[PDB]
């Protein structure tokens, strides 16, 4: 999450360091990045 | 491009490096690593400019020591055209795939 | 790499095109979670200081990057070079709530205070810009008070924004902004 | 606005693109005569480094400009870069001019230039000008194309041609149909020329300026 | 052990030749990586000090050995007996870059500063002599500043030079240089 | 008149021969650092055309000539031919000076020059001159050799070195033992130097003199 | 690398102590050292 290179369980329990992200029931920017064509709208020569 | 359909035009993109000063004549420029194109049906077009430098890196900052720039003076020109004078050829910028960035430095910026 | 432009579908281009090869970049550093975990020393305005973020200098790394992605979530790791006993108090809790030793009333040592801080907003997410200088009273990560606080730093944690914003910088003047680097 | 046709042609690092494409045409050849000849006795090498585009100006196709103006351009010709230094450090060699000719106005004018790439010559009879339709050549018209392009082979009289004093290739564009600005058409068309020397190898070598 | 000499192919010789045996030497100490890992206290010239190496006394062990192999690579382990807060800044980073607490701004204790330092040059390798008193502005391992620095030491790490240089010493006068050792 | 030893070394078209051979020696390297680096992004090519011999003069080893005269010769250096034009049309590149050094007198003299090929530098301490025996180097003596030869690799500080303003390679020959004409020996030995730039590739390119 | 006789993983993670040497694709001085003959260009006697 940035700079956490501790080899231990950072001692203090899981439900203690940070606050647990309850669920319900690059995410997207990587989705529209990994899809850019380097092709050619004609046909390469030489 | 943004101009009329009665405005067929031609442009150029030269890319020279450190060691000499950039041209002013596509003629002299056609000797760098370039390319030529002309308005059509499809408008946009994105040219990737090469990563060339002694060290695999170099800085983002600069000095009045680097007026000779360690990375070059890219320079775009203009061939010929037709009733295509005063048109709009807007150029944008993204990171190519080869792109990379490192060594975090924070230092007063507004 | 031509294409249609009034369509704005991402249409990049790369080396190979006219020649050359393309490399294996290691952007580890431009990793949003990575370069937001590193403390920002904002002015601890007196004693009763609110764990806000738009208080921070909108020009620092963790500040700037902060002001570039509308939404966001993360936790907190603070620092308090100070006097007395830091008695933090949760979000929503009455200003006055921060005083009773029973509350997390830390006991001074030498010299600041390093503690962990949960993200405690009633909203599933927070923001640096609420269209609803004029941003919500639930937008605070708790609130501290001691009896004289001299250093206020906020190491944001487990970072993760959403949506983007505009990134600009140091308007040069000579098409190339000159500023002394690190020389031999 | 049609069957749709685009195209970019890479030569070394230089790459001309276009949209009013029309295609091309190679004439006479499509290959190259075994450039591993006797006269070069193994003493010949490939220098596909200077193989690429350079710019030179043709005339200016103007309304008046009669039915004949065919601005010539010899190939080889003055080279301020690679291929030129090569000809100054070498005696014997051979290539093949790519040639991708443009002439910008817009899709509203009238008339046509006649592009052609012909070999050994000296000068041409007007009465003959009615047959460029015999050597590598293209036809320009703003209502279909903005670009020409025609890629020429190696002819020479020999396998490894010398250019200090000889130029086998010449490029002409006689105005077959005069230009008409018209109602809303463009004002003038400066015929620009983009060339490139291909599949070329050298043999031979002199001392130095010193 | 005769041989051809204007050929300079390595042509050594050893004991056995005329007699005697040859032994099992344990040169562990003359190990280049080993005898370069041990701090060199160079003068921390004021506060804004550049992590250069040709600043060090070209007569000390880690200095000398340093000045004997043209190329090289290694990391850093520093020391800073000092005042205020050491706020180091990477290579290339604007002189001015070193000031913002967000940057690695260490907080004083007692008495110096022991921290690790990556080798951060844009070049795949560095050198004490660039033929390109006159050596490159990218030749710096970052740059420190506090508010008064009294002790500057550089424990070079994971050392490894390349290519050699000339090694000479204390020009005697009596074919045997005399200097008091350690006596009973 | 011995174990017998001859040798000719071809580089492109140029080929130095010798009879007082002695051998050679490559130092530091024998290879070359993967010249398919990132900074050149595929934009680099092999131009083994200018890879060959050119002549330049060292000093004149004369009897007086003290125990130190080590005429330097930077490498790179002024090129009236290929490799030079290459450096003028290019920014980034890298090679490896072959170097086949001669010094003609005859098999009767005394003394020795000390040939060496060392990288990045500025200037050397006399007290250091007693250790060229550390970098690619040879030893000359008219009673065994007339030629030296030592073939240097690429060091540079980077993968693709620029030479408009930088010269990583320098060549020195300090007189280790003064010269003695003697009874019937030769009169003087002009130390001649034969060099060649090898395994070299370029990347980069500027406009033109125009 | 000099004087590192710690029995632990020096706590702080690998990608943290030193900077990782990305690859691409006495080294040599030992190569020209371990090859010096102590022979004789004639023939031993006695």
Question: How many other β-carbons are positioned within 10 Å of the β-carbon of residue D90?
Answer: 18
Eight-class DSSP state of C36: G
> What is the spatial distance between Cα C176 and Cα B16, in angstroms, rounded to a whole number?
17
Determination technique for this entry: X-ray
Residue ranges per structural domain of chain D: 1-210
- For the purposes of burial, counting CB atoms within 10 Å of the CB of E76, is it exposed (0-12), middle (13-18) or buried (19 or more)? buried
- D208: closest CA of chain F, how far (Å): 6
For residue C37, give the nearest of A1, A12, A40 by CB distance: A1
Residue B23's nearest CA partner among F28, F10, F205, F149 is: F205
Nearest Cα to Cα of residue F168 among F117, F112, F104: F117
Question: For helices D82-89 and F82-89, what crossing angle results, to 10°?
Answer: 170
Q: d(Cα F147, Cα F104) in Å, to the nearest integer?
A: 8
In b/e form, how buried is each residue of E36-66, taking b as 16+ CB within 10 angstroms? bbeebebebeebebbbbbebbeeeeebbebb
Q: Write out the CATH class of domain E1-184.
A: mainly beta
Do F81 and D208 contact (CB within 8 A), yes or no? yes
Phi then psi dihedrals of residue C90, to 5 deg? -50, 180
User: Nominal resolution in Å?
Assistant: 3.5
Nearest CA distance, B5 vs chain F (angstrom): 34
- 3-state SS string over E48-100? CEECCCCCCCCCCHHHHCHHHCCEEEEEEEEECCECCCCECECCCCCHHHCCC
- Distances in Å between the Cα of C131 and the Cα atoms of C69, C127, D181 are 14, 10, 56
CA max distance for chain E: 70
Whole-angstrom distance, CA of residue D52 vs CA of residue F149? 39
Find all residues with CB under 8 Å of D136, minimum gap 6, and list them: D25, D26, D27, D28, D116, D117, D118, D150, D151, D152
C57: burial class by Cβ within 10 Å (0-12, 13-18, 19+)? Answer: middle
Sign of the four-CA dihedral D10, D12, D16, D21: negative
| Distances from the Cα of C33 to the Cα of B102, C156, E55, angstroms | 14, 9, 38
What ranges do the domains of chain C cover? 1-184
C121 forms beta bridges with: none
CATH code of domain A1-46: 4.10.90.10
- Cβ atoms within 10 A of the Cβ of F36, count? 13
Three-state SS at F174: strand
Say yes or no for a CB contact (<8 Å) between C17 and D17. Answer: no
Strands (E), C19-151: 41-42, 49-50, 71-79, 115-117, 126-127, 143-144
Q: Rounded distance, CA C41 to CA E104, Å?
A: 12
Contacts of B54 in chain E (CB under 8 A): 123
For residue C170, CA distances in Å to A36, B52, B102, B103, D38 come to: 30, 25, 19, 19, 66
* CA atoms of C180 and C59, how far apart (whole Å): 19
Region for residue D204 given its phi and psi (left: phi exceeds 0; alpha: psi -120 to 50; beta: otherwise): left
Quick check: B104 contacting E, CB < 8 Å?
yes
Please report, for chain A, the start and end positions of each structural domain, with discontinuous segments joined by +: 1-46
Residues of chain G with C-beta less than 8 angstroms from the C-beta of E11 = 36-37
Count CB neighbours of F35 within 10 A: 18
Pairing of strands D112-118, D169-177: antiparallel
Residues of C in contact with D7 (CB under 8 A): none
- Centre a 10 Å sphere on the Cβ of residue G15 and count the other Cβ atoms it contains: 10
* Chain B residues interacting with chain D (CB cutoff of 8 angstroms): 5-10, 26-28, 30-31, 33-42, 45, 79-84
A7 touches chain G (CB under 8 A): yes
d(CA E85, CA E83): 7
Chain E residue with minimal CA distance to F37?
Answer: E124
- Calpha distance E84→E86 (Å, rounded): 7
Q: Which fold has domain F1-210?
A: Jelly Rolls (2.60.120)
Chain E residues inside the 8 Å CB shell of F25: 7-9
* Distance between CA atoms of residues E39 and E55, nearest Å: 14
Chain A residues with CB inside 8 Å of C3's CB?
Answer: 37, 41
CA of E96 to nearest chain F CA: how many angstroms apart?
Answer: 28
Which residue of D4, D8, D30, D198 is the best one to mutate when testing the A interface, meaning the one whose CB has the most A CBs within 10 A? D8
CA distance C68 to A41: 35
Q: Do chains A and F touch (3 or more CB pairs under 8 A)?
A: no
CA distance F19 to chain D (A): 27
């Amino acid at each position: 999450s940035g700079n956490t290179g501790s080899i231990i369980n950072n001692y203090y329990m899981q439900q203690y360091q940070n606050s647990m992200d309850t669920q319900l029931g690059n995410d997207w920017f990587s989705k529209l990045a990994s899809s850019a064509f380097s092709g050619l709208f004609g046909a390469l020569l030489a | 491009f943004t101009g009329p359909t009665d405005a067929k035009a031609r442009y150029m993109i030269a890319y020279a490096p450190p060691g000499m000063e950039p041209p002013k004549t596509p003629e002299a420029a056609a000797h760098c690593i370039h390319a030529e194109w002309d308005t059509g049906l499809n408008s946009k077009f994105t040219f990737s400019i090469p990563y060339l430098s002694a060290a695999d890196y170099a800085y983002t900052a600069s000095d009045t020591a680097e007026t000779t720039n360690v990375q070059g003076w890219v320079c775009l020109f203009q061939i010929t055209h037709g009733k295509a004078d005063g048109d709009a050829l807007v150029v944008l910028a993204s990171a190519g795939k080869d792109f990379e960035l490192r060594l975090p430095v924070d230092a007063r910026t507004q | 790499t031509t294409s249609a432009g009034e369509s704005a579908d991402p249409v990049t281009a790369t080396v190979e095109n006219y020649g050359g090869e393309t490399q294996v970049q290691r952007r580890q550093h431009t990793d949003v979670s990575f370069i937001l975990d590193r403390f920002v020393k904002v002015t601890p305005k007196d004693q009763i200081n609110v764990l806000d973020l738009m208080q921070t200098p909108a020009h620092t790394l963790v500040g700037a990057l902060l002001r570039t992605a509308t939404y966001y979530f993360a936790d907190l790791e603070v620092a308090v070079k100070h006097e007395g006993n830091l008695t933090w108090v949760p979000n929503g809790a009455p200003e006055a709530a921060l005083d009773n030793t029973t509350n997390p009333t830390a006991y001074h040592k030498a010299p600041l205070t390093r503690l962990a801080l949960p993200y405690t907003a009633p909203h599933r997410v927070l923001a640096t810009v609420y269209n609803g200088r004029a941003l919500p009273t639930s937008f605070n990560y708790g609130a501290i008070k001691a009896t004289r606080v001299t250093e206020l730093l906020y190491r944001m944690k487990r970072a993760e924004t959403y949506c983007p914003r505009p990134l600009l910088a140091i308007h040069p003047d000579q098409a190339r902004h000159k500023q002394k680097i690190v020389a031999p | 606005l049609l069957e749709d046709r685009i195209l970019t042609t890479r030569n070394g690092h230089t790459t001309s693109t276009t949209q009013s494409s029309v295609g091309v045409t190679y004439g006479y050849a499509t290959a190259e005569d075994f450039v591993s000849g006797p006269n070069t006795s193994g003493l010949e090498t490939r220098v596909a480094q200077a193989e690429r585009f350079f710019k030179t100006h043709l005339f200016d196709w103007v309304t008046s400009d009669p039915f004949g103006r065919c601005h010539l351009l010899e190939l080889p010709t003055d080279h301020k870069g690679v291929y030129g230094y090569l000809t100054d450090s070498y005696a014997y060699m051979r290539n093949g001019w790519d040639v991708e000719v443009t002439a910008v106005g817009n899709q509203f004018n009238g008339g046509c230039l006649l592009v052609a790439m012909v070999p050994e010559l000296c000068s041409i009879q007007k009465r003959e000008l009615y047959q460029l339709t015999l050597f590598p050549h293209q036809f320009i018209n703003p209502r279909t194309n903005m670009t020409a392009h025609i890629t020429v082979p190696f002819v020479g009289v020999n396998r490894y041609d010398q250019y200090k004093v000889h130029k086998p290739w010449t490029l002409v564009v006689m105005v077959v149909a005069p230009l008409t600005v018209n109602s809303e058409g463009a004002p003038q068309i400066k015929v620009y020329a983009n060339i490139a020397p291909t599949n070329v190898h050298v043999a031979g070598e002199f001392p130095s300026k010193e």
